Amino acid sequence: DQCIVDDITYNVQDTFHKKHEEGHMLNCTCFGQGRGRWKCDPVDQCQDSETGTFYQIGDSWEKYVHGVRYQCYCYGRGIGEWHCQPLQTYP
Amino acid sequence: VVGLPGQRGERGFPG
Ligand SMILES: *[C@@H]1O[C@H](CO)[C@@H](O)[C@H](O)[C@H]1NC(C)=O
């Protein structure tokens, strides 16, 4: 048996990632069972409350809001945890 | 608190 997903063929027991249509990341397994059955779970990841954009653990990004630029980081930590800091010049 | 959706499929999924 094999799984077919977004035109990609998987062997039974394969694991893979897939982006959901709404933008977030999934981790998936190919089960097969006679009908190429597969399932995907959302992974732990962050969602920017303003832009709706998803970021993966370890990703950083900049927000430009209230006329202020910030740098943000996705920690995850099982709760899609992220934080930002104002853009800052250093020596 | 509301989780993100997962996804599933297979040959002959109804949907
Ligand atoms: C997604 O990953 C978690 C481990 O981080 C695993 O327990 C779960 O079985 C995976 N789900 C699928 C559908 O592969």
Side-chain angles (χ1 to χ4, degrees), chain A residues 14-16 26-31 38-43, chain B residues 7:
Chain A
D14 276 356
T15 59
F16 57 105
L26 309 168
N27 70 283
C28 320
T29 297
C30 177
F31 293 102
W38 51 277
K39 169 176 184 37
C40 297
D41 298 336
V43 312
Chain B
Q7 200 165 41

mmCIF file of all heavy atoms in Angstrom, chain A residues 14-16 26-31 38-43, chain B residues 7, ligand 1:
data_model
loop_
_atom_site.group_PDB
_atom_site.id
_atom_site.type_symbol
_atom_site.label_atom_id
_atom_site.label_comp_id
_atom_site.label_asym_id
_atom_site.label_seq_id
_atom_site.Cartn_x
_atom_site.Cartn_y
_atom_site.Cartn_z
ATOM 1 N N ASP A 14 6.054 5.933 6.431
ATOM 2 C CA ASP A 14 6.746 7.201 6.173
ATOM 3 C C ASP A 14 6.168 8.300 7.043
ATOM 4 O O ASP A 14 4.974 8.297 7.347
ATOM 5 C CB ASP A 14 6.582 7.631 4.731
ATOM 6 C CG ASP A 14 7.592 6.982 3.803
ATOM 7 O OD1 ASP A 14 8.480 6.245 4.279
ATOM 8 O OD2 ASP A 14 7.493 7.245 2.602
ATOM 9 N N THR A 15 7.011 9.256 7.426
ATOM 10 C CA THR A 15 6.532 10.453 8.056
ATOM 11 C C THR A 15 6.997 11.637 7.227
ATOM 12 O O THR A 15 8.048 11.570 6.582
ATOM 13 C CB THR A 15 7.046 10.616 9.478
ATOM 14 O OG1 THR A 15 8.472 10.651 9.490
ATOM 15 C CG2 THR A 15 6.582 9.475 10.350
ATOM 16 N N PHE A 16 6.227 12.721 7.271
ATOM 17 C CA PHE A 16 6.461 13.861 6.394
ATOM 18 C C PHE A 16 5.769 15.063 6.982
ATOM 19 O O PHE A 16 4.947 14.934 7.884
ATOM 20 C CB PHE A 16 5.972 13.586 4.960
ATOM 21 C CG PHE A 16 4.503 13.208 4.851
ATOM 22 C CD1 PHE A 16 3.563 14.124 4.380
ATOM 23 C CD2 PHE A 16 4.073 11.927 5.174
ATOM 24 C CE1 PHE A 16 2.214 13.777 4.261
ATOM 25 C CE2 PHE A 16 2.717 11.572 5.060
ATOM 26 C CZ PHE A 16 1.792 12.499 4.602
ATOM 27 N N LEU A 26 1.888 20.896 9.571
ATOM 28 C CA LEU A 26 1.410 19.627 10.081
ATOM 29 C C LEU A 26 2.549 18.615 10.004
ATOM 30 O O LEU A 26 3.409 18.704 9.143
ATOM 31 C CB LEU A 26 0.261 19.114 9.201
ATOM 32 C CG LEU A 26 -0.892 20.060 8.895
ATOM 33 C CD1 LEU A 26 -1.764 19.488 7.785
ATOM 34 C CD2 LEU A 26 -1.707 20.328 10.172
ATOM 35 N N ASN A 27 2.540 17.643 10.912
ATOM 36 C CA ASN A 27 3.369 16.470 10.777
ATOM 37 C C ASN A 27 2.465 15.255 10.591
ATOM 38 O O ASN A 27 1.438 15.120 11.265
ATOM 39 C CB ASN A 27 4.332 16.292 11.958
ATOM 40 C CG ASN A 27 3.620 15.906 13.241
ATOM 41 O OD1 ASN A 27 2.992 16.746 13.909
ATOM 42 N ND2 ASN A 27 3.711 14.617 13.601
ATOM 43 N N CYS A 28 2.839 14.393 9.656
ATOM 44 C CA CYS A 28 1.928 13.364 9.161
ATOM 45 C C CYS A 28 2.584 12.004 9.119
ATOM 46 O O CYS A 28 3.809 11.878 9.072
ATOM 47 C CB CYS A 28 1.448 13.717 7.752
ATOM 48 S SG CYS A 28 1.098 15.478 7.518
ATOM 49 N N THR A 29 1.735 10.983 9.100
ATOM 50 C CA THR A 29 2.180 9.613 8.961
ATOM 51 C C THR A 29 1.374 8.933 7.855
ATOM 52 O O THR A 29 0.157 9.159 7.721
ATOM 53 C CB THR A 29 1.980 8.825 10.262
ATOM 54 O OG1 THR A 29 2.792 9.395 11.281
ATOM 55 C CG2 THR A 29 2.390 7.354 10.073
ATOM 56 N N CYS A 30 2.046 8.120 7.047
ATOM 57 C CA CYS A 30 1.348 7.268 6.069
ATOM 58 C C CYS A 30 1.055 5.919 6.689
ATOM 59 O O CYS A 30 1.979 5.174 7.046
ATOM 60 C CB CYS A 30 2.195 7.064 4.818
ATOM 61 S SG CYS A 30 1.471 5.944 3.537
ATOM 62 N N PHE A 31 -0.238 5.623 6.805
ATOM 63 C CA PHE A 31 -0.703 4.356 7.374
ATOM 64 C C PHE A 31 -1.028 3.287 6.311
ATOM 65 O O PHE A 31 -0.762 2.106 6.523
ATOM 66 C CB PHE A 31 -1.923 4.572 8.266
ATOM 67 C CG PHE A 31 -1.632 5.353 9.530
ATOM 68 C CD1 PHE A 31 -1.961 6.693 9.623
ATOM 69 C CD2 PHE A 31 -1.046 4.739 10.627
ATOM 70 C CE1 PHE A 31 -1.699 7.420 10.791
ATOM 71 C CE2 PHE A 31 -0.787 5.450 11.798
ATOM 72 C CZ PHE A 31 -1.107 6.796 11.880
ATOM 73 N N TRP A 38 -3.819 8.258 5.443
ATOM 74 C CA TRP A 38 -2.803 9.090 6.101
ATOM 75 C C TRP A 38 -3.469 10.049 7.032
ATOM 76 O O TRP A 38 -4.656 10.335 6.881
ATOM 77 C CB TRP A 38 -1.997 9.902 5.095
ATOM 78 C CG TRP A 38 -2.850 10.673 4.138
ATOM 79 C CD1 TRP A 38 -3.415 10.194 2.994
ATOM 80 C CD2 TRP A 38 -3.244 12.051 4.231
ATOM 81 N NE1 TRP A 38 -4.122 11.186 2.374
ATOM 82 C CE2 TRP A 38 -4.029 12.334 3.110
ATOM 83 C CE3 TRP A 38 -2.991 13.076 5.157
ATOM 84 C CZ2 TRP A 38 -4.583 13.599 2.877
ATOM 85 C CZ3 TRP A 38 -3.533 14.321 4.934
ATOM 86 C CH2 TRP A 38 -4.318 14.580 3.798
ATOM 87 N N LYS A 39 -2.717 10.533 8.016
ATOM 88 C CA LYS A 39 -3.224 11.526 8.943
ATOM 89 C C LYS A 39 -2.127 12.534 9.268
ATOM 90 O O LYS A 39 -0.944 12.206 9.213
ATOM 91 C CB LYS A 39 -3.716 10.877 10.237
ATOM 92 C CG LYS A 39 -3.996 11.923 11.324
ATOM 93 C CD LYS A 39 -4.578 11.344 12.600
ATOM 94 C CE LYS A 39 -4.926 12.453 13.605
ATOM 95 N NZ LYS A 39 -5.461 13.700 12.974
ATOM 96 N N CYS A 40 -2.534 13.753 9.620
ATOM 97 C CA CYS A 40 -1.598 14.832 9.942
ATOM 98 C C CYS A 40 -2.062 15.541 11.215
ATOM 99 O O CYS A 40 -3.256 15.785 11.373
ATOM 100 C CB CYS A 40 -1.549 15.859 8.804
ATOM 101 S SG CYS A 40 -0.949 15.297 7.206
ATOM 102 N N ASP A 41 -1.117 15.869 12.110
ATOM 103 C CA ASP A 41 -1.390 16.663 13.301
ATOM 104 C C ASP A 41 -0.716 18.017 13.143
ATOM 105 O O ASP A 41 0.342 18.120 12.529
ATOM 106 C CB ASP A 41 -0.777 16.029 14.565
ATOM 107 C CG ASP A 41 -1.344 14.646 14.877
ATOM 108 O OD1 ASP A 41 -2.456 14.329 14.462
ATOM 109 O OD2 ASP A 41 -0.669 13.860 15.543
ATOM 110 N N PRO A 42 -1.309 19.056 13.738
ATOM 111 C CA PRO A 42 -0.619 20.359 13.758
ATOM 112 C C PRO A 42 0.579 20.256 14.690
ATOM 113 O O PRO A 42 0.491 19.651 15.751
ATOM 114 C CB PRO A 42 -1.668 21.299 14.368
ATOM 115 C CG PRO A 42 -2.515 20.402 15.228
ATOM 116 C CD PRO A 42 -2.632 19.119 14.379
ATOM 117 N N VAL A 43 1.708 20.804 14.300
ATOM 118 C CA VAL A 43 2.836 20.806 15.194
ATOM 119 C C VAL A 43 2.794 22.043 16.084
ATOM 120 O O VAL A 43 2.048 23.007 15.870
ATOM 121 C CB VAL A 43 4.143 20.782 14.426
ATOM 122 C CG1 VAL A 43 4.066 19.696 13.346
ATOM 123 C CG2 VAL A 43 4.388 22.141 13.797
ATOM 124 N N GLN B 7 -5.429 17.164 9.603
ATOM 125 C CA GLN B 7 -5.987 16.795 8.313
ATOM 126 C C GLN B 7 -5.835 15.294 8.138
ATOM 127 O O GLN B 7 -4.931 14.687 8.717
ATOM 128 C CB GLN B 7 -5.209 17.528 7.224
ATOM 129 C CG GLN B 7 -5.899 17.658 5.923
ATOM 130 C CD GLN B 7 -5.217 18.689 5.055
ATOM 131 O OE1 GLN B 7 -3.990 18.752 5.007
ATOM 132 N NE2 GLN B 7 -6.007 19.518 4.383
HETATM 133 C C1 LIG C 1 3.267 14.318 14.943
HETATM 134 O O1 LIG C 1 4.365 14.392 15.856
HETATM 135 C C2 LIG C 1 4.160 13.900 17.182
HETATM 136 C C3 LIG C 1 5.513 13.846 17.905
HETATM 137 O O2 LIG C 1 6.008 15.172 18.013
HETATM 138 C C4 LIG C 1 3.813 12.449 17.133
HETATM 139 O O3 LIG C 1 3.551 12.001 18.463
HETATM 140 C C5 LIG C 1 2.559 12.311 16.329
HETATM 141 O O4 LIG C 1 2.292 10.909 16.236
HETATM 142 C C6 LIG C 1 2.808 12.851 14.925
HETATM 143 N N1 LIG C 1 1.549 12.691 14.198
HETATM 144 C C7 LIG C 1 1.476 12.122 13.000
HETATM 145 C C8 LIG C 1 0.043 12.057 12.411
HETATM 146 O O5 LIG C 1 2.436 11.681 12.373
#
